[PDB]
Amino acid sequence: PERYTWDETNFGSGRDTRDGFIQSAPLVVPPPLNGILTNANPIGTKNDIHFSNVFNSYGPLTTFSHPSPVYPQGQIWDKELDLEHKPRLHITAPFVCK
Amino acid sequence: GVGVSTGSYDNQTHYRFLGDGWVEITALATRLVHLNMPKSENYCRIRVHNTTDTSVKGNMAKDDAHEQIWTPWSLVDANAWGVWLQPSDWQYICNTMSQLNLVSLDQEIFNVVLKTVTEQDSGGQAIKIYNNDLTACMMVAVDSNNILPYTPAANSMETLGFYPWKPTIASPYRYYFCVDRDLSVTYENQEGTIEHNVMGTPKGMNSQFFTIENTQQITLLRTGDEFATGTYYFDTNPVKLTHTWQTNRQLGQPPLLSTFPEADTDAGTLTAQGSRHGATQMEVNWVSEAIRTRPAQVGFCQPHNDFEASRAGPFAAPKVPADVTQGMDREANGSVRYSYGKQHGENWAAHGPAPERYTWDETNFGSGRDTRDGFIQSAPLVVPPPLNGILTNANPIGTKNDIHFSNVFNSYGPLTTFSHPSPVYPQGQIWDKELDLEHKPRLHITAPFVCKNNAPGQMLVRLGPNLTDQYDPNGATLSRIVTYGTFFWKGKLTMRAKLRANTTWNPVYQVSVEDNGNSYMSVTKWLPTATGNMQSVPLITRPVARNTY
Amino acid sequence: DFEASRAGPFAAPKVPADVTQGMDREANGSVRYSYGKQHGENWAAHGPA
Amino acid sequence: GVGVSTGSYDNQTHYRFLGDGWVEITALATRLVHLNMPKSENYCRIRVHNTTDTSVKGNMAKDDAHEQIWTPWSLVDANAWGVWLQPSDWQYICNTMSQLNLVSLDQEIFNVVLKTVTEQDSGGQAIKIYNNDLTACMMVAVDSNNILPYTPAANSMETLGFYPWKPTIASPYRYYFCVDRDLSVTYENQEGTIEHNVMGTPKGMNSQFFTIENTQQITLLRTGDEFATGTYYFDTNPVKLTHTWQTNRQLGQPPLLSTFPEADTDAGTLTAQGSRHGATQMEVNWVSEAIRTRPAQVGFCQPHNDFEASRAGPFAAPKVPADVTQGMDREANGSVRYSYGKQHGENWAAHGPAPERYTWDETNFGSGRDTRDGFIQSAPLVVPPPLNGILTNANPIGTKNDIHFSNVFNSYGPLTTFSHPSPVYPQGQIWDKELDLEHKPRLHITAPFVCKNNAPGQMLVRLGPNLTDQYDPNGATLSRIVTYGTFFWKGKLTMRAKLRANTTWNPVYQVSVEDNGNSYMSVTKWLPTATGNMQSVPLITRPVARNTY
Amino acid sequence: NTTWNPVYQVSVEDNGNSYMSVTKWLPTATGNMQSVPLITRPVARNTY
Amino acid sequence: LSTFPEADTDAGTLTAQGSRHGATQMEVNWVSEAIRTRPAQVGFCQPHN
Amino acid sequence: QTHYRFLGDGWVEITALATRLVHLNMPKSENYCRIRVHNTTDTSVKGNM
DNA sequence: ATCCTCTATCAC
DNA sequence: ACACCAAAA
DNA sequence: ATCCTCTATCAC
DNA sequence: ACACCAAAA
DNA sequence: ATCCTCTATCAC
DNA sequence: ACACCAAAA
DNA sequence: ATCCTCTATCAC
DNA sequence: ACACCAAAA
DNA sequence: ATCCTCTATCAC
DNA sequence: ACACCAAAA
Ligand SMILES: [Ca+2]
Ligand SMILES: [Ca+2]
Ligand SMILES: [Ca+2]
Ligand SMILES: [Ca+2]
Ligand SMILES: [Ca+2]
Ligand SMILES: [Ca+2]
Ligand SMILES: [Ca+2]
């Protein structure tokens, strides 16, 4: 089968794991060592597993953009989960019936 | 056709009282603005790279990389409490009301003054002669449709004077352009190099260049002309004027007493934790205020100094302000630090360029978090936890000594409910536009009022190019008669509040002043000096206790 | 997730859910009630228990 | 009576959408114009002879001989796309519409500024003082009846600024007069002399001398005055916004296939040319796409560098633009070369007087001609032609090595059908007057729109003679107070277009931009510099494929 | 249209090695063709 | 801006981070695009696999 | 076909027309089958899940 | 306040 | 946009 | 375009 | 000139 | 004379 | 303050 | 149930 | 056969 | 005789 | 069950 990867175009919303870092306490001009966790330091003793793979930035002030539709192959509309508490959207498709 | 004023000075504030204790506050702002020729005759796409700082290993959190577009136009922002109300008033409103809300805004420009300067007396010394040109003109325009990007002046303490009897000037219009900056991570000295600290060039897909002239209707103003706004109506949500306290530990039914105090000293007791009724979501066969079930989660844990980065570069993540707690964890519960300066506070007689600063600690108690005491137990709950049976604010993550679960833990979720921040009196921003993102943010920390629909068009101004007898278009760079001007600006801001109701018993915290002391609230602070200098210190908004359940 | 504020410490509430084969109770917020004779109990149950 | 603006700045563009996808585009142009005293106080009948160049043997094609009449008046031409629309817009229109047409024009002058300069400070150094005279006036007039000869400014890149935030000035009014110049033919060095390179004197029968003052109604404008045009209605033919391709070889019924391809590689075959049905106008008993009969002739052969001459002197014959073809035969299919300069493109930071140039290759394919392959066979057609049985682009005419049948062959005729040229975005001319010749030309290469009836009267302007205390009419030549001025010009241009329909399958060529590259279409080109410099590069008009049969 | 500077448009390109090459949305000699996903939202927005 | 470019090459400069006006939610006595206050958070960090 | 109906204020009413020839043969199972699917062949590996 | 060289799209 | 050039624009 | 510390001799 | 001070100015 | 990127709170 | 953004504000 | 590349001789 | 191609067919 | 901290689901 | 919280419930 032929395959195609779709890279979303909502820039300014993306994230570059490499440069993402958490400093500490009381902010310091140039951080020590044990004063900043980076995408190098390993979590739970695994070499390649970093804070990224477990960090969730989401929250109140977290605002973003609805994905886009993909021309051929893409899905158009979709039903909504019958869950008393719904999801802010489906990645499955663009249009979700209210 | 000239020699007759075109407007009228009025910097008053009216409290119109209506029934059921509703109130119609009316803000009157009049101000004298000065303005001189924009150095660049055109639009400049300028870049800014601080290699001088980005090059250091630890330094990144000091990154100022970006590329703005400099417009020869100047903005007229009044979006800052400090511009409308009088110290005392803010007192009054806060000490007396229960809620406040934006209603409508009305702006007005008039009494245009245009002058040119001629540096003469070359036959004697070096003097300067002042005189006004009548034909000369000014230019105004309003981006009502908001085609241009939003540029809040408080976003830089560059709004207008908070002092009426003293003039003021305008911040020049400048806006961001698309680049795609990149910077690597490093610490104190480490080893190797900063692998790559790049900037970048304009991308076809996101290049956006506007021009006041191709977007708005510009109006010419000579001396006798005058300009006036429409009347914008705010479509916003009101802001409570009361702080809260209650935390998950104090929500509803206090446990039942079995032991009653004897004297005003000793306390009382409850029933056996083992043999006590109630509910919990832990397996233990007992009960404690700590583990008892509550309606929802008040406040939540936020990640400390979460510098994240995108094609733009790195930046600190914003975060919902909250009480600092005994833990004095500021950066931990998003307090904010302002750096205002002499048109917005400062003393006045303060020497040097050193700006005055103020950190604001939010008053929504019961919502704060004390990092120290925060801890995660394990599995199957155990009375007193082992060691490898509880992670604390001591244990280090990813091999770093000072980095703990706090700096990466995010408590947020469905049951996580909190309170909208409060406004800061002088220096504070009032309203703000909303991000055009199909999925919005539950609020902005940037300001109190966020417009549900479209928002106040920004008011742009610029002097008109006063030409000389010599002019060649193809000519390198050329002369223009020196010129500058002034004009008054008048604003109208209407608000709606209601009087608070008294129901307690025990009096309650009120914003007050104090005799000549070393007290934060000391009259003298809001008083003139012998030479006439004064400062404006932020004031408490929401002096009175609320209730949340 | 015992968190704490000016009030003191306390366990964070959490949306109940199925426990799963994993029998992870405290993990998917099941709730434990401790009612007593006007609200259940047998009746002939002895002691304050 | 002064100190109050008389008009309003607005350089916007509105797209009014109506049903059936029709559209009403509205162009708004506002511009600041500067103007100084006309050196000649009168009308000058001046002559121009470039003997310095005409004298050489090969040189003639460089002849600039003529005699113009210099009027102390200045023209205000806005007839140039670049003045109305914004880069992006032209994109939009072209990428989205299917046709465009002129509708109406409206001009307006206002906010007059008149100043005099007094060079003083002779008691110190050498300064210049600026100040405005109120009583002073400006003069405007409109040759609505078009008594004066037409003088399109694009006919010289001297129209108005294409950049709004930057001022501009006017081209002075000048027009041709009757002489009867004559020049002989010569090459590289030859022998003998240039037999006679004469100019000549005014002829009684064709002498035509006009004067703004005896032809128009001049209106005086002081500072508080203002002037405004009527509202001209264009009576013109629309311009398609699509290029074509099909050539005589692809018109209608493709021959019948007898052999069908096996794989995406190999091709298919037709039927025996001998044993194939169809029609031709050659005697041969076979058939081939080359000789088959077509509806008519698409495009035609034009004579190369056909310098012809009349009582005026020599000049190159104009010629209907067309595709250049693989043959890259520019001068052969009339592409055009423009030499614009900084108010009309140029970069800006380009050094020296060197003007920037651009050659425009027409996009009406299937209409072009490749000189190389063009050939004439003989009599009675022969399968493979002899030698003296076919004249090619190798064989020389009249004993000159490089002069072939092409340079003298004219393919034009009844069955010769073609396409109207296209407009060029910046720098291009919009409309034009028609020659008052009882027998007209099927179009002008000069511009897209030619007025069927009368046309837009030219707008003339001139400053008024500011006299001194000293004046003698019989006096040789005399003083007048230095003076110069400015004013804004506002134009309104309305157009009508319709949206294109999508019917293909396969997407189609669209005008787009590209990331920071070495690409012709690179955002950066239409962007400001750090000091604020920018250029305007011509853009493709008719990006989309049409159909002609 | 409000910018100045033109803007990204979805277009095709001559017979190349370009992602956007007419030929992709064209039939073969035996009549074969593919459908390649296309860009939705070629044009720059604004969010603030 | 406090420093204006000379030629289409070199860039411009800002004011002293220490001596610059604005607001931030970090304790430092300076200012930088990186730490400055913004309206809200655009995009967010998601857990990998 | 596909029609672009143009209305004022630049609103547009697009109309999609789809016609297609469908083929269909007898459903092998005459009934409803509750079938199961386990890929032990892959689930058994250590890394694979 | 533009209509084909006047006034005068005067020829409406 | 009448108002299309020489009449009945 | 003056009314008792606002708007508002608003309390007429 | 009501219009007077705390209501019904 | 401010309404969500035009004109046009035009959608009243 | 309609006029809440994509329709029938 | 043919009208100038859609619907729509829709522009009657 | 209006219904003539870019408007008011 | 329950309506979001008063009177007052008073805002109907 | 208006009566949805800050206006015109
Ligand atoms: Ca609008
Ligand atoms: Ca005439
Ligand atoms: Ca006239
Ligand atoms: Ca008064
Ligand atoms: Ca408007
Ligand atoms: Ca049909
Ligand atoms: Ca009650």
Side-chain angles (χ1 to χ4, degrees):
Chain A
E2 189 160 296
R3 315 168 198 264
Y4 183 59
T5 287
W6 181 268
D7 284 303
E8 192 47 37
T9 26
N10 64 318
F11 312 123
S13 325
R15 292 298 154 99
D16 176 354
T17 16
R18 289 69 169 291
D19 323 330
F21 70 88
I22 304 177
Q23 260 223 49
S24 185
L27 203 62
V28 292
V29 184
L33 168 283
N34 40 289
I36 164 179
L37 187 171
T38 78
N39 196 208
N41 321 312
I43 324 294
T45 92
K46 298 307 171 64
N47 293 81
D48 307 55
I49 298 295
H50 300 78
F51 79 147
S52 308
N53 315 58
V54 281
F55 190 53
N56 181 193
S57 190
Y58 193 47
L61 288 130
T62 308
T63 165
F64 59 103
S65 161
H66 195 242
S68 57
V70 192
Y71 176 47
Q73 306 97 42
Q75 183 172 70
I76 307 176
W77 63 90
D78 191 51
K79 169 187 178 176
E80 175 56 293
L81 282 295
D82 192 357
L83 294 181
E84 18 248 308
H85 289 85
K86 330 291 177 184
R88 286 195 74 175
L89 73 93
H90 302 182
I91 55 302
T92 310
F95 299 115
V96 202
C97 304
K98 303 184 196 172
Chain B
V2 88
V4 190
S5 297
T6 60
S8 37
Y9 193 107
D10 192 352
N11 205 275
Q12 285 176 164
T13 293
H14 307 148
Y15 291 98
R16 208 184 181 198
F17 289 98
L18 321 68
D20 306 9
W22 287 90
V23 193
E24 195 196 62
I25 297 72
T26 318
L28 283 187
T30 310
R31 215 128 304 197
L32 171 41
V33 184
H34 170 294
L35 168 54
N36 8 37
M37 314 179 291
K39 277 4 178 180
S40 67
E41 239 319 304
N42 8 49
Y43 292 69
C44 302
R45 195 232 311 180
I46 297 178
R47 194 168 67 171
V48 163
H49 209 331
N50 47 323
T51 66
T52 310
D53 283 293
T54 53
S55 297
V56 187
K57 298 288 190 70
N59 288 2
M60 36 203 53
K62 277 185 175 180
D63 183 40
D64 274 355
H66 76 270
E67 175 163 44
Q68 64 183 60
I69 293 186
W70 175 277
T71 76
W73 290 74
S74 287
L75 222 164
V76 183
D77 200 274
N79 201 332
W81 304 91
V83 62
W84 308 92
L85 326 176
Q86 199 177 63
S88 61
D89 291 330
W90 184 265
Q91 162 168 54
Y92 192 112
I93 298 138
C94 292
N95 269 330
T96 296
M97 311 310 167
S98 97
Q99 47 174 282
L100 173 50
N101 201 180
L102 268 34
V103 194
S104 85
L105 158 65
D106 210 323
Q107 313 208 48
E108 185 183 328
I109 289 165
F110 59 100
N111 254 286
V112 176
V113 203
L114 290 185
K115 298 175 179 294
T116 48
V117 312
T118 51
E119 307 157 52
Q120 195 184 51
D121 213 21
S122 283
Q125 194 183 317
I127 202 69
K128 295 178 76 172
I129 312 173
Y130 295 110
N131 59 319
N132 43 200
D133 173 344
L134 308 171
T135 73
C137 76
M138 172 164 97
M139 301 174 142
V140 175
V142 173
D143 175 47
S144 66
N145 295 291
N146 288 309
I147 308 72
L148 305 67
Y150 212 37
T151 312
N155 217 166
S156 63
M157 311 327 307
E158 285 184 61
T159 77
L160 267 53
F162 290 14
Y163 307 104
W165 54 111
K166 304 286 284 183
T168 174
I169 43 178
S171 168
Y173 192 51
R174 45 187 179 294
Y175 67 99
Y176 294 112
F177 183 31
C178 207
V179 282
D180 262 0
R181 178 236 166 48
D182 177 51
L183 174 62
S184 305
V185 200
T186 33
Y187 59 89
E188 264 289 47
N189 289 298
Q190 181 132 327
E191 265 183 23
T193 42
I194 47 183
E195 276 226 333
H196 26 308
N197 176 306
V198 188
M199 183 60 97
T201 64
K203 243 179 173 180
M205 291 192 272
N206 309 331
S207 295
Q208 266 189 172
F209 169 53
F210 304 128
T211 144
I212 315 311
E213 290 79 320
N214 291 70
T215 58
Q216 260 65 49
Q217 304 189 308
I218 310 166
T219 307
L220 270 44
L221 285 179
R222 275 183 177 175
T223 314
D225 297 296
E226 91 82 78
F227 179 85
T229 243
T231 318
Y232 181 78
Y233 288 156
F234 279 101
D235 179 21
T236 60
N237 285 301
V239 175
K240 295 285 177 68
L241 301 197
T242 41
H243 58 292
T244 60
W245 53 277
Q246 310 181 193
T247 316
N248 264 255
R249 280 291 282 295
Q250 331 84 298
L251 296 191
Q253 187 74 289
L256 208 292
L257 288 181
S258 49
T259 292
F260 281 53
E262 289 292 56
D264 303 323
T265 60
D266 58 325
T269 88
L270 322 176
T271 299
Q273 300 199 325
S275 297
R276 188 148 78 199
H277 303 82
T280 175
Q281 19 211 36
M282 235 88 253
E283 290 312 285
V284 310
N285 280 56
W286 43 281
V287 164
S288 70
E289 284 310 72
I291 56 174
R292 194 172 82 175
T293 50
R294 309 298 180 159
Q297 156 190 178
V298 191
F300 65 124
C301 301
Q302 324 198 66
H304 310 300
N305 314 328
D306 168 38
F307 291 63
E308 311 172 306
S310 172
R311 294 174 160 278
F315 62 83
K319 41 204 191 184
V320 315
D323 170 51
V324 69
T325 300
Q326 290 153 295
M328 293 239 103
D329 288 294
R330 277 103 179 301
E331 290 188 48
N333 284 309
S335 267
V336 191
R337 199 162 177 65
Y338 301 72
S339 332
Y340 49 110
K342 307 280 187 165
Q343 278 206 298
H344 309 69
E346 196 91 335
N347 156 291
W348 249 337
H351 305 87
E356 189 159 296
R357 315 168 198 264
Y358 183 59
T359 287
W360 181 268
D361 284 303
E362 192 47 37
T363 26
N364 64 319
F365 312 123
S367 325
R369 292 298 154 99
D370 176 354
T371 16
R372 289 69 169 291
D373 323 330
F375 70 88
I376 304 177
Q377 260 223 49
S378 185
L381 203 62
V382 292
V383 184
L387 168 283
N388 40 289
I390 164 179
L391 187 171
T392 78
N393 196 208
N395 321 312
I397 324 294
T399 92
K400 298 307 171 64
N401 293 81
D402 307 55
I403 298 295
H404 300 78
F405 79 147
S406 308
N407 315 58
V408 281
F409 190 53
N410 181 193
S411 190
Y412 193 47
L415 288 130
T416 308
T417 165
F418 59 103
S419 161
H420 195 242
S422 57
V424 192
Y425 176 47
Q427 306 97 42
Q429 183 172 70
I430 307 176
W431 64 90
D432 191 51
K433 169 187 178 176
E434 175 56 293
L435 282 295
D436 192 357
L437 294 181
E438 18 248 308
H439 289 85
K440 330 291 177 184
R442 286 195 74 175
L443 73 93
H444 302 182
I445 55 302
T446 310
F449 299 115
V450 202
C451 304
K452 303 184 196 172
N453 61 317
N454 181 255
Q458 323 211 67
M459 187 184 307
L460 300 194
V461 184
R462 123 164 205 185
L463 274 177
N466 207 336
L467 273 194
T468 52
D469 73 300
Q470 266 276 279
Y471 184 67
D472 191 50
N474 336 67
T477 300
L478 54 176
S479 57
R480 57 165 182 174
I481 301 171
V482 186
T483 325
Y484 76 116
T486 67
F487 61 81
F488 300 71
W489 167 88
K490 205 206 302 177
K492 191 218 78 301
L493 190 47
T494 56
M495 289 155 262
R496 156 186 289 125
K498 181 173 175 178
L499 308 191
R500 68 185 182 77
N502 199 161
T503 113
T504 65
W505 159 283
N506 45 95
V508 63
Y509 197 32
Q510 285 296 69
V511 185
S512 186
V513 197
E514 247 312 295
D515 301 315
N516 194 29
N518 323 307
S519 189
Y520 182 33
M521 302 282 107
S522 170
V523 284
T524 331
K525 314 193 79 176
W526 298 284
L527 279 149
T529 66
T531 60
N533 309 315
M534 44 233 299
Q535 43 176 180
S536 197
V537 190
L539 284 182
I540 322 72
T541 303
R542 296 170 175 178
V544 194
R546 173 134 129 244
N547 190 209
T548 324
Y549 182 106
Chain C
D1 168 38
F2 290 63
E3 311 172 306
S5 172
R6 294 174 160 278
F10 62 83
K14 41 204 191 184
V15 315
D18 170 51
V19 69
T20 300
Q21 290 153 295
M23 293 239 103
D24 288 294
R25 277 103 179 301
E26 290 188 48
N28 284 309
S30 267
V31 191
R32 199 162 177 65
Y33 301 72
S34 332
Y35 49 110
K37 307 280 187 165
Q38 278 206 298
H39 309 69
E41 196 90 335
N42 156 291
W43 249 337
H46 305 87
Chain D
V2 88
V4 190
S5 297
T6 60
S8 37
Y9 193 107
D10 192 352
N11 205 275
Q12 285 176 164
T13 293
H14 307 148
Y15 291 98
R16 208 184 181 198
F17 289 98
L18 321 68
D20 306 9
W22 287 90
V23 193
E24 195 196 62
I25 297 72
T26 318
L28 283 187
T30 310
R31 215 128 304 197
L32 171 41
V33 184
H34 170 294
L35 168 54
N36 8 37
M37 314 179 291
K39 277 4 178 180
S40 67
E41 239 319 304
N42 8 49
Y43 292 69
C44 302
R45 195 232 311 180
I46 297 178
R47 194 168 67 171
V48 163
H49 209 331
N50 47 323
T51 66
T52 310
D53 283 292
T54 53
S55 297
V56 187
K57 298 288 190 70
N59 288 3
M60 36 203 53
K62 277 185 175 180
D63 183 40
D64 274 356
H66 76 270
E67 175 163 44
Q68 64 183 60
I69 293 186
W70 175 277
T71 76
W73 290 74
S74 287
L75 222 164
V76 183
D77 200 274
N79 201 332
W81 304 91
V83 62
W84 308 92
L85 326 176
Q86 199 177 63
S88 61
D89 291 330
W90 184 265
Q91 162 168 54
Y92 192 112
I93 298 138
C94 292
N95 269 330
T96 296
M97 311 310 167
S98 97
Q99 46 174 282
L100 173 50
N101 201 180
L102 268 34
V103 194
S104 85
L105 158 65
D106 210 323
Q107 313 208 48
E108 185 183 328
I109 289 165
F110 59 100
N111 254 286
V112 176
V113 203
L114 290 185
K115 298 175 179 294
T116 48
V117 312
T118 51
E119 307 157 52
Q120 195 184 51
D121 213 21
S122 283
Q125 194 183 317
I127 202 70
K128 295 178 76 172
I129 312 173
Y130 295 110
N131 59 319
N132 43 200
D133 173 344
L134 308 171
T135 73
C137 76
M138 172 164 97
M139 301 174 142
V140 175
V142 173
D143 175 47
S144 66
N145 295 291
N146 288 309
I147 308 72
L148 305 67
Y150 212 37
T151 312
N155 217 166
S156 63
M157 311 327 307
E158 285 184 61
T159 77
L160 267 53
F162 290 14
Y163 307 104
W165 54 111
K166 304 286 284 183
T168 174
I169 43 178
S171 168
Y173 192 51
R174 45 187 179 294
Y175 67 99
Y176 294 112
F177 183 31
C178 207
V179 281
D180 262 0
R181 178 236 166 48
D182 177 51
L183 174 62
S184 305
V185 200
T186 33
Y187 59 89
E188 264 289 47
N189 289 298
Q190 181 132 327
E191 265 183 23
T193 42
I194 47 183
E195 276 226 333
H196 26 308
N197 176 306
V198 188
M199 183 60 97
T201 64
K203 243 179 173 180
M205 291 192 272
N206 309 331
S207 295
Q208 266 189 172
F209 169 53
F210 304 128
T211 144
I212 315 311
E213 290 79 320
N214 291 70
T215 58
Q216 260 65 49
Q217 304 189 308
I218 310 166
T219 307
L220 270 44
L221 285 179
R222 275 183 177 175
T223 314
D225 297 296
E226 91 82 78
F227 179 85
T229 243
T231 318
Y232 181 78
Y233 288 156
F234 279 102
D235 179 21
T236 60
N237 285 301
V239 175
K240 295 285 177 68
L241 301 197
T242 41
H243 58 292
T244 60
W245 53 277
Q246 310 181 193
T247 316
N248 264 255
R249 280 291 282 295
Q250 331 84 298
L251 296 191
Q253 187 74 289
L256 208 293
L257 288 181
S258 49
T259 292
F260 281 53
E262 289 292 56
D264 303 323
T265 60
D266 58 325
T269 88
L270 322 176
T271 299
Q273 300 199 325
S275 297
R276 188 147 78 199
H277 303 82
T280 175
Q281 19 211 36
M282 235 88 253
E283 290 312 285
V284 310
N285 280 56
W286 43 281
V287 164
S288 70
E289 284 310 72
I291 56 174
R292 194 172 82 175
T293 50
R294 309 298 180 159
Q297 156 189 178
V298 191
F300 65 124
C301 301
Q302 324 198 66
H304 310 300
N305 314 328
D306 168 38
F307 290 63
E308 311 172 306
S310 172
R311 294 174 160 278
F315 62 83
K319 41 204 191 184
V320 315
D323 170 51
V324 69
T325 300
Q326 290 153 295
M328 293 239 103
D329 288 294
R330 277 103 179 301
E331 290 188 48
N333 284 309
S335 267
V336 191
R337 199 162 177 65
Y338 301 72
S339 332
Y340 49 110
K342 307 280 187 165
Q343 278 206 298
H344 309 69
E346 196 91 335
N347 156 291
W348 249 337
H351 305 87
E356 189 160 296
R357 315 168 198 264
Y358 183 59
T359 287
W360 181 268
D361 284 303
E362 192 47 37
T363 26
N364 64 318
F365 312 123
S367 325
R369 292 298 154 99
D370 176 354
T371 16
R372 289 69 169 291
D373 323 330
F375 70 88
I376 304 177
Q377 260 223 49
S378 185
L381 203 62
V382 292
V383 184
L387 168 283
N388 40 289
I390 164 179
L391 186 171
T392 78
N393 196 208
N395 321 312
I397 324 294
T399 92
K400 298 307 171 64
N401 293 81
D402 307 55
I403 298 295
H404 300 78
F405 79 147
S406 308
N407 315 58
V408 281
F409 190 53
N410 181 193
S411 190
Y412 193 47
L415 288 130
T416 308
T417 165
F418 59 103
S419 161
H420 195 242
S422 57
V424 192
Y425 176 47
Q427 306 97 42
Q429 183 172 70
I430 307 176
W431 63 90
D432 191 51
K433 169 187 178 176
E434 175 56 293
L435 282 295
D436 192 357
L437 294 181
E438 18 248 308
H439 289 85
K440 330 291 177 184
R442 286 195 74 175
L443 73 93
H444 302 182
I445 55 302
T446 310
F449 299 115
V450 202
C451 304
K452 303 184 196 172
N453 61 317
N454 181 255
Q458 323 211 67
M459 187 184 307
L460 300 194
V461 184
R462 123 164 205 185
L463 274 177
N466 207 336
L467 273 194
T468 52
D469 73 300
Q470 266 276 279
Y471 184 67
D472 191 50
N474 336 67
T477 300
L478 54 176
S479 57
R480 57 165 182 174
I481 301 171
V482 186
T483 325
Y484 76 116
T486 67
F487 61 81
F488 300 71
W489 167 88
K490 205 206 302 177
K492 191 219 78 301
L493 190 47
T494 56
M495 289 155 262
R496 156 186 289 125
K498 181 173 175 178
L499 308 191
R500 68 185 182 77
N502 199 161
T503 113
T504 65
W505 159 283
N506 45 95
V508 63
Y509 197 32
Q510 285 296 69
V511 185
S512 186
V513 197
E514 247 312 295
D515 301 315
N516 194 29
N518 323 307
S519 189
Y520 182 33
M521 302 282 107
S522 170
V523 284
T524 331
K525 314 193 79 176
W526 298 284
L527 279 149
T529 66
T531 60
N533 309 315
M534 44 233 299
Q535 43 176 180
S536 197
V537 190
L539 284 182
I540 322 72
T541 303
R542 296 170 175 178
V544 194
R546 173 134 129 244
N547 190 209
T548 324
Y549 182 106
Chain E
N1 199 161
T2 113
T3 65
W4 159 283
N5 45 95
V7 63
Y8 197 32
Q9 285 296 69
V10 185
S11 186
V12 197
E13 247 312 295
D14 301 315
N15 194 29
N17 323 307
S18 189
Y19 182 33
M20 302 282 107
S21 170
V22 284
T23 331
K24 314 193 79 176
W25 298 284
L26 279 149
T28 66
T30 60
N32 309 315
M33 44 233 299
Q34 43 176 180
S35 197
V36 190
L38 284 182
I39 322 72
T40 303
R41 296 170 175 178
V43 194
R45 173 134 129 244
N46 190 209
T47 324
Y48 182 106
Chain F
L1 288 181
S2 49
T3 292
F4 281 53
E6 289 292 56
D8 303 323
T9 60
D10 58 324
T13 88
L14 322 176
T15 299
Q17 300 199 325
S19 297
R20 188 147 78 199
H21 303 82
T24 175
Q25 19 211 36
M26 235 88 253
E27 290 312 285
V28 310
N29 280 56
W30 43 281
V31 164
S32 70
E33 284 310 72
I35 56 174
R36 194 172 82 175
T37 50
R38 309 298 180 159
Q41 156 189 178
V42 191
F44 65 124
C45 301
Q46 324 198 66
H48 310 300
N49 314 328
Chain G
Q1 285 176 164
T2 293
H3 307 148
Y4 291 98
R5 208 184 181 198
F6 289 98
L7 321 68
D9 306 9
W11 288 90
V12 193
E13 195 196 62
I14 297 72
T15 318
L17 283 187
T19 310
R20 215 128 304 197
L21 171 41
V22 184
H23 170 294
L24 168 54
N25 8 37
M26 314 179 291
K28 277 4 178 180
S29 67
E30 239 319 304
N31 8 49
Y32 292 69
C33 302
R34 195 232 311 180
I35 297 178
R36 194 168 67 171
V37 163
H38 209 331
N39 47 323
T40 66
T41 310
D42 283 292
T43 53
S44 297
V45 187
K46 298 288 190 70
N48 288 2
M49 36 203 53

